[PDB]
Amino acid sequence: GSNQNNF
Ligand SMILES: [Zn+2]
């Protein structure tokens, strides 16, 4: 699966 971190 793809991951996205929005800090
Ligand atoms: Zn993955």
What can you tell me about this protein's structure?
It has no helix or strand. By secondary structure, the chain is largely without helices or strands. Bound molecules: zinc ion. It is classed as protein fibril. The entry lists the keywords Amyloid fibril, prion, zinc binding.
Question: Any key phrases for this structure?
Answer:
about 0% strand, little secondary structure, binds zinc ion, about 5 residues
Number of H- or I-type helical stretches: 0
Q: Which sheet architecture does the biggest sheet show?
A: none
The portion of residues forming beta strands comes to under 5%
The helix/strand class is little secondary structure
The coarse silhouette is rod-shaped
Helical content class: under 10%
Report how far the terminal alpha carbons are from each other. 19 Å
The number of distinct β-strands equals 0
Please give the radius of gyration in angstroms.
7 Å
What small molecules does this complex bind? Answer: zinc ion
PDB class: protein fibril
Keywords: Amyloid fibril, prion, zinc binding, protein fibril
Assembly: monomeric
Entry title: 1.35 A MicroED structure of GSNQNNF at 2.4 e- / A^2
